[PDB]
Design a protein around this ligand. Structure first.
Ligand code: SF4
Ligand code: SF4
Ligand code: SF4
Ligand code: SF4
Ligand code: FES
Ligand SMILES: [Ca+2]
Lengths: 905, 584, 146
């Protein structure tokens, strides 16, 4: 299409509306109610331009550019005097009731309303009357509510309801008393409620966790990092100030997590700021804890390692690729053990084999929203991979999108799309041990044990393709529902099969692979998604090694006298008693970690590693994409006695001191090149980010904004002399403003979005080639593996039905978004949000034991009698007992595990 | 059409002459808010374009400015030739009362331009500074050596990839530079300094017991006569332009104060006028009158300092005490108005920081009654002394040709008989509404002639203050523009729109739309100009400051050659320079 | 619908005839106003209705009808200030068709602009106070704009 803006010709896409087309060209139109992800509704009337019928037209007409299609040969004007005066009048009308709140408002300096008030040039107030006020609600521990600052742009309700699928937020009231919130005080129920702080263009919804230790946006030090709280790998911008992590903002990745995080990623960063973290290396001498510097800790550790006869290394899926590789190099490939259980490692390896050998394309998180039918097998995605659940909701609304497109309704006119697609939606079939949070939009929900879910998947694969193995013992109504699933999936142009390793069953993953193969054989454009557990689970699976049980037997039999545990608490992957016995038997335990774990009581040496905020590295997400996270701040800048290094730096210097009796604090690119040379399956991680020599016209990339303040006074209480600026030899970023963050810079790693006149999160529009699309010059991250030409075979190992045996109790996993991730549990703000641990029981089983709802029962596993109060779960299958995974004492290795001595306390 | 409107200046006769001489495709005309025709010339045609402008019927006789620009990070270069770097040449035709900027584009690898020293002899120091701060080579330059940084300096500080902040201090570098200073006199080679050839060699500096700064002069002597002399400058280099690339538009005003520290608001004036050109701000008349008031008060302060310093350099010691009492009276008024003495930082984008305090007219009337009897006493006690006249008259004289070819402005140029004052030729800040004369010399610029012209300028500034006191407008002290930084304080404190504008203007900075502006003013020591490039951001993309003391110090060897050393001291005392103005 | 005077009483009750007169036929149920009724009070009641019956979806109606309501309340009590009638006219021209989301706000501003057009002396009689948006803050000299 061709448009003429202010007499200048432009070539745009005709399917877009005028506002997004003009913002993609760099033109500045003020706007409030439109969002690139939510569509156009034409409420705020801020985006007004003047449209003319032809070139020889002088009068024109004011139109909303967000609601005007960018048709071919469209003549408009933004800088028309009438349009400018109307946009100024809209800003003024918004400003009549706005509170005098900017100094004491957390959105100041990050406010879209401030930016558009300045952009319209409106700075004189001629309104002399009273301003309306509102009471505020309590929205829980995460979101702070300030209703006075609202401009009634309806972004919150549209996002939270039409996009996120939440139910408890809404718009109440009338003419100019419109209220946006919950009907009563209470916590926002959605797992994606945290994106309201970026969706809201004003200070109504604010980050309460940030509002505790508040600082303005110009005062933050930012870095482009990857969220470490599950395997999705959403791009984040951690921002720090005064040596502590202050905020997690969304970082735009048009291929992964474009505008939206989940609440675990956004608010579960509080473990970084804990005061019990290791900040110096500590050596045990009898009962004494001697604090060492880097050099003497490395010398003593390498000497004791040299006197040892066999050193084993226990990695972790929390650690980066470089740190796991450095441990593998230090202890040797044959002595390296992945720090996960044998069943967990088997499920992880099977998921990786399906992803990179099954011949079926695995979509990115953004690409999930374009699929026509979704089958989720055994994976509670809302609690384990939440952004996948959000993308599944978008893919479900794709049917309403297609129905509206059949009636020649444009894709940005969201109200008409929702009107045409009333309740018609794409087929969604979820299977779990109980009800999921996707049940409100699911076409069918199957509450069954993991064997029965696997048998359902194998039956679906057999009915789609008769070459697949059959299932014997299917009930006729279950067969009818299976047939419903089969005709829904076979009629889909782009079916999607989602599973993962959190189900605790190998057969569920095998059944999902069988369904995907059966759909691939029919010619469908099938995609497969596997949800892992931790941030670098796929990286640890690609690296390979032994299981944690093998390392425990190596420690117990005395074949290994030295163990180096990297970023692993060892209690989430094995029993605590056996781990404690093996670590007490081992004469040398060296724990390289950044969190105070329980295994440092018996550890001979504790190396104060860096977390993601204080380190660089690479992580492989659930779809096999290598992503580089960068260090946010130097921990030794404010506390000069802090020796907190990267884990790969610790292990590489330990290897160098073990070999040549000399420390070597290496560079990140050297470890990256070592990974690429030694492990060819991880050769793609070289291209995740450019090396430390990367420059933009000769200068580095800035971590902090141009107006970063207090540089001669933040450390003046320690010493009036300004310290040396921390040098960054590992990466292309600098710990200063002396760098580049231009939106037109040829790069893909963007620490934060800021353009002049756009201080809000809306500056990501300036950082994209087209708004709502990809990052300009490509999104960061590279897929490690391509789709194989030939797939796997059908898995003939069809499990039997779940048999409830007396005495035994099958543990059904119950994951929680706030409580299943270890570091997220360590965050103090999650302690109020996380629920009290309830053991879930069937009504029939609770009647059999005679226990009611709320009474405490005690059960023993691995000789550990623990007590929990009972919650009645009707959707659970009899013979199963539900356990909340990741919680206090309930390790996630209990999925699929049997249970003994379930008795009332 | 306001004065700040973006003009292309295609109706200038110089554009038609250039088109008729070199053809229509030989150059590109850029539309700016600088007020001058900006013409991008090809590099190979630069010397003939400069010669053609020098041979015009009313020629461009003065090279006003010559400096570089790093355009690698400039995003809004629409209609501009492709350039990793550029070099601009600002030329002034006094007879036409016009000026033209010529810009030469340069690639990143091919950073060399033909030298301009043959057409204009004052291009030498400008090309040395452009090489020093940008790495731009000038082919045919006699001694292309560093002029601000020491010779053992790596990198070019005004480039975009150069880190602006201070490096970590090291005693090793201080000890090495002390050893270099100690062995400098032992291993002095008069070939790297641009000199040639009983010829004594002496160093005047680097420390100097005077009030104009501390700088070093290498003197070649035949007995008492000065055969050759080059100045070693850059000892007072504060990196003010690089700070222009690091501050916001509003928070850079205190840095503009300290360019020449005897001027204050006189130094603030061209910067805020250029920023108001970038912002599209037409300030009201009371703002113009207040800014003229403060500029003339600081002009009287600076001229009293200059006359006292000259008299003390001659040898009389008492008038400096008396004129410092007069400076105390001026400082009392300035302290009452702005709150500070010599770096007020009171001018704002769109106006001034506060209104005039109630009672300022009493202090102005007291100073206006105090000044003239004291000035007459200074004249009759020192300026009419025949010993002072013998020490001053005939010392370092030059005509209009030497003043034009060296870029000499201010009292020296007008002492050569050229009636070129910025306040009359190219009026700014409502200077047309004041009745004042421009004193001129007979055609020869002595030390004594320059000093008496500064005395007459002081009297004319007293006349301006009298007219301003008798006719004071009532109105706003800030413009009503949305880009007036900061907004008026009471509206900020009780209106949310004004609070939002204030919040974003003081924190992130005011957003100047992408343009280029230029303001030239008649400062206390000559012509002071600000050339501002905005890339659409809250910071300046380029802040070029042309100061007159640089040009006067470059004119120093061409006027004192063949004279004595006491004549050199008197000439230094009568130039009206400060080393901060030289190095900035 | 817009107010019409007695000169427009000899007009046929058709859509096109009332359209060229500067009004709408509407529901063709006419309402007559005599000399006893102050037009400022009547238009204030009309605008209070139209501002309380807003749906709150779109900015100009939702935040500009209450401003006109408060201005008309000030004109009713004689507390009007200069710029108020100019504000009403700006509201009338900035709440027309296309500017707002639906047709409630053009129909709201039609009687206001018609009453200003035909009975401006009644609106000008409510302006009795000088314009004052700021109060003096001690220690801060105001910017005395002209
Ligand atoms: S929401 Fe924005 S405009 Fe409103 S008080 Fe906060 S910073 Fe100011
Ligand atoms: S609360 Fe925020 S997002 Fe919701 S309508 Fe108000 S300004 Fe918009
Ligand atoms: S979905 Fe996973 S990776 Fe993304 S923000 Fe949530 S916890 Fe982090
Ligand atoms: S003009 Fe219509 S859509 Fe807009 S707020 Fe008023 S009643 Fe609602
Ligand atoms: S952005 Fe178009 S009316 Fe709100
Ligand atoms: Ca680092």
């Amino acid at each position: 299409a061709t448009i003429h803006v202010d007499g200048k010709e432009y070539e745009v896409n005709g399917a877009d509306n005028l506002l997004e087309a003009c913002l993609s060209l760099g033109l500045d139109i003020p706007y409030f109610c439109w969002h690139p992800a939510l569509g156009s509704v034409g409420a705020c009337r801020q985006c007004a331009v003047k449209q003319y019928q032809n070139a020889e037209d002088t009068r024109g007409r004011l139109v909303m550019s967000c609601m005007t299609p960018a048709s071919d040969g469209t003549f408009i004007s933004i800088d028309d005097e009438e349009a400018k005066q109307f946009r100024e009048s809209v800003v003024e009308w918004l400003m009549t009731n706005h509170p005098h709140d900017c100094p004491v408002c957390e959105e100041g300096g990050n406010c879209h309303l401030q930016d558009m008030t300045v952009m319209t040039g409106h700075s004189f107030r001629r309104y002399r009357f009273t301003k309306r006020t509102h009471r505020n609600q309590d929205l829980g521990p995460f979101i702070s509510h300030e209703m006075n600052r609202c401009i009634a742009c309806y972004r919150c309700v549209r996002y939270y309801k039409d996009y996120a699928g939440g139910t408890d937020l809404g718009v109440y009231g009338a003419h100019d008393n419109v209220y946006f919130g919950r009907p009563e005080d209470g916590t926002l129920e959605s797992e994606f409620s945290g994106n309201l702080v970026e969706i809201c263009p004003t200070g109504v919804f604010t980050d309460k966790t940030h509002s505790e230790r508040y600082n303005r946006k110009w005062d933050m030090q930012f870095a482009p990092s990857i969220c470490q709280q599950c395997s999705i790998g959403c791009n984040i911008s951690p921002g720090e100030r005064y040596g502590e992590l202050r905020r997690i903002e969304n970082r735009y990745n048009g291929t992964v997590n474009h505008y939206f995080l989940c609440d675990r990623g956004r608010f579960g960063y509080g473990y970084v700021n804990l005061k019990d973290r290791p900040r110096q290396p500590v050596q045990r001498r009898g009962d004494d804890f001697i604090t060492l510097n880097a050099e003497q800790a490395m010398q003593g550790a390498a000497d004791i390692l040299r006197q040892s006869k066999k050193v084993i290394g226990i990695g972790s899926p929390r650690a980066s690729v470089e740190s796991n590789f450095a441990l593998r190099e230090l202890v040797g490939e044959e002595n390296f053990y992945t720090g996960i259980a044998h069943g967990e490692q088997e499920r992880l390896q099977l998921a990786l084999k399906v992803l990179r050998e099954g011949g079926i394309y695995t979509p990115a998180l953004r690409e999930i929203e374009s699929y026509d039918a979704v089958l989720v097998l055994g994976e509670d995605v809302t609690q384990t991979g939440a952004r996948v659940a959000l993308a599944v909701r978008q893919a479900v609304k794709g049917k309403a999108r297609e129905m509206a497109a059949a009636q020649k309704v444009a894709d940005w006119q969201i109200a008409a799309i929702l009107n045409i697609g009333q309740r018609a939606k794409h087929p969604l079939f979820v299977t779990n041990v109980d009800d999921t949070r996707l049940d409100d939009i699911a076409a069918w929900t199957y509450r069954a044990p993991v064997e029965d879910q696997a048998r359902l998947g194998f039956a679906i694969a057999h009915a789609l393709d008769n070459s697949a193995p059959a299932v014997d013992g299917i009930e006729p109504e279950l067969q009818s529902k299976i047939d419903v699933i089969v005709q829904a999936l076979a009629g889909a142009k782009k079916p999607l099969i989602i599973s993962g390793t959190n189900a605790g069953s190998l057969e569920v993953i095998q059944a999902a692979a069988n369904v995907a193969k059966a759909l691939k054989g029919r010619g469908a454009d099938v995609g497969i998604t596997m949800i892992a557990r931790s941030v670098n689970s796929m990286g640890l699976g690609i690296m390979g090694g032994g299981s944690l049980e093998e390392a425990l037997t190596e420690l117990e039999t005395g074949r290994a006298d030295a163990v180096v545990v990297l970023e692993n608490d060892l209690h989430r992957h094995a029993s605590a008693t056996r781990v404690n016995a093996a670590l007490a038997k081992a004469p040398l335990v060296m724990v390289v970690d950044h969190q105070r774990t329980a295994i440092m009581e018996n550890a001979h040496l504790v190396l104060s590693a860096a977390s993601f905020a204080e380190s660089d590295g690479t992580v492989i997400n659930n779809e096999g994409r290598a992503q580089r996270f960068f260090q946010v701040y130097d921990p030794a800048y404010y506390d000069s006695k802090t020796v907190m290094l990267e884990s790969w730096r610790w292990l590489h210097s330990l290897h160098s001191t073990l070999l040549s009796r000399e420390v070597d604090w290496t560079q990140l690119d050297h470890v990256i090149d070592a990974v690429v040379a030694k492990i060819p399956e991880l050769a793609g991680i070289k291209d995740a980010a450019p090396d430390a020599t990367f420059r933009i016209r000769g200068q580095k990339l800035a971590r902090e904004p141009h107006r970063y303040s207090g540089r001669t006074a933040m450390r003046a209480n320690i010493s009036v002399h300004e310290p040396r600026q921390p040098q960054d030899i590992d990466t292309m970023f600098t710990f200063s403003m002396e760098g580049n963050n231009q939106p037109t810079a040829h790069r893909s790693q963007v620490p934060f979005a800021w353009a002049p006149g756009w201080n809000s999160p809306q500056a990501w529009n300036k950082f994209q080639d087209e708004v709502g699309g990809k990052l300009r010059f490509g999104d960061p991250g590279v897929r490690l593996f391509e789709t194989s030409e030939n797939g796997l075979d059908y898995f003939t190992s069809v499990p039997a039905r779940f048999q409830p045996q007396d005495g035994k109790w099958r543990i059904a996993p119950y994951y929680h978004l706030f409580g299943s991730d270890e570091l997220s549990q360590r965050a103090p703000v999650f302690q109020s949000r996380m629920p009290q641990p309830y053991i879930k029981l069937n009504p029939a089983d609770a009647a059999k034991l005679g226990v009611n709802a709320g009474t405490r029962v005690s059960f023993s596993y691995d000789g550990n009698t623990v007590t929990l109060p009972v919650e009645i779960a009707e959707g659970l299958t009899a013979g199963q007992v539900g356990l909340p995974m990741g919680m206090s004492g309930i390790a996630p290795v209990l999925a699929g595990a049997h249970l003994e001595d379930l008795k009332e306390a | 059409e306001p004065a700040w409107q973006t003009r292309d200046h295609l109706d200038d006769p110089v554009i038609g002459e250039l088109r008729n001489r070199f053809g229509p495709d030989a150059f590109t005309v850029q539309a700016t808010r600088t007020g001058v025709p900006v013409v991008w010339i090809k590099r190979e045609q630069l010397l003939e374009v400069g010669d053609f402008l020098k041979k015009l019927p009313k020629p461009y006789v003065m090279l006003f400015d010559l400096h570089g620009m790093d355009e690698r990070l400039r995003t809004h270069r629409e209609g501009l030739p492709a350039a990793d770097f550029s070099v601009f040449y600002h030329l002034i035709s006094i007879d036409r009362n016009r000026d033209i900027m010529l810009k030469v584009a340069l690639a990143e690898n091919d950073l060399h331009v033909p030298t301009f020293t043959k057409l204009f002899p004052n291009a030498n120091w400008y090309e040395r500074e452009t090489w020093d701060l940008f790495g731009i080579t000038f082919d045919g330059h006699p001694n292309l050596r560093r002029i601000m940084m020491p010779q053992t300096w790596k990198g070019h500080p005004l480039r975009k990839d150069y880190p602006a902040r201070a490096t970590e201090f090291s005693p090793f570098e201080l000890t090495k530079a002390k050893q270099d200073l100690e062995m400098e006199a032992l291993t002095f080679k008069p070939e790297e300094w641009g000199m040639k050839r009983d010829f004594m060699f002496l160093n005047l500096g680097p420390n100097h017991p005077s009030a104009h700064g501390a700088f070093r002069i290498v003197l070649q002597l035949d007995g008492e006569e000065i055969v050759d002399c080059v100045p070693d400058i850059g000892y007072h280099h504060r990196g003010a332009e690089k700070m222009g690339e690091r501050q916001s538009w509003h928070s850079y005003i205190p840095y503009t104060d300290r360019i020449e520290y005897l001027g204050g608001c006189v130094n603030e004036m061209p910067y805020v006028l250029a920023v108001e050109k970038l912002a599209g701000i037409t300030v009201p008349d009371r703002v113009n009158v207040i800014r003229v008031m403060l500029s003339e008060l600081f002009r009287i302060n600076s001229h009293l300092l200059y006359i006292s310093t000259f008299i003390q350099d001659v040898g009389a010691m008492t008038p400096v005490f008396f004129a410092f009492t007069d400076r105390q009276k001026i400082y009392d008024l300035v302290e009452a108005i702005t709150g500070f003495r010599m770096h007020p930082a009171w001018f704002r984008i769109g106006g001034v920081a506060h209104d005039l305090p109630r009672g300022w007219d009493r202090l102005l009337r007291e100073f206006l009654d105090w000044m003239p009897k004291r000035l007459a006493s200074y004249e009759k006690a020192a300026l009419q002394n025949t010993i002072l006249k013998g020490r001053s008259q005939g010392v370092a004289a030059y005509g209009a040709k030497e003043a034009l070819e060296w870029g000499t402005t201010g009292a020296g140029l007008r002492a050569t008989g050229i009636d070129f004052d910025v306040r009359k030729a190219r009026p700014y800040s409502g200077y047309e509404n004041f009745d004042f004369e421009i004193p001129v010399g007979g055609g020869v610029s002595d030390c004594y002639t320059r000093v008496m012209l500064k005395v007459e300028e002081l009297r004319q500034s007293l006349r301006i203050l009298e007219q301003c006191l008798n006719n004071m407008p009532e109105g706003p002290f800030k413009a009503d523009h949305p880009l007036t930084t900061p907004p008026p304080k009471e509206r900020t404190l009780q209106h949310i729109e004004t609070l939002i504008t204030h919040f974003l203007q003081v924190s992130w900075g005011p957003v100047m739309p992408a343009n280029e502006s230029f303001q030239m003013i008649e400062a206390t020591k000559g012509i002071n100009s600000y050339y501002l490039t905005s890339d659409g951001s809250t910071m300046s993309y380029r802040t070029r400051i042309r100061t007159p003391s640089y040009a006067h110090l470059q004119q120093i060897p061409a006027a004192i050659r063949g004279s004595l050393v006491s004549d050199l001291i008197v000439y230094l005392g009568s130039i009206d320079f400060v080393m901060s103005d030289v190095d900035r | 619908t817009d107010f019409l005077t007695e000169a427009h009483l000899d007009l046929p009750m058709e859509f096109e005839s009332i359209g060229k007169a500067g009004s709408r036929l509407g529901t063709a149920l006419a309402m007559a106003v005599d000399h006893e009724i102050n037009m400022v009070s009547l238009v204030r009641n009309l605008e209070e209705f139209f501002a309380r019956e807003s749906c709150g979806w779109c900015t100009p109606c939702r935040d500009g009808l209450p401003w006109s309501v408060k201005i008309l309340r000030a004109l009713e009590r004689g507390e009007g200030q200069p710029g108020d009638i100019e504000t009403l006219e700006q509201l009338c021209r900035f709440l027309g068709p296309g500017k707002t989301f639906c047709a409630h706000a053009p129909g709201a501003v039609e009687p206001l602009q018609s009453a200003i057009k035909y009975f401006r002396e009644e609106f000008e009689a409510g302006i009795k106070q000088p314009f004052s948006n700021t109060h003096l803050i001690n220690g801060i000299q105001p910017n005395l704009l002209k």
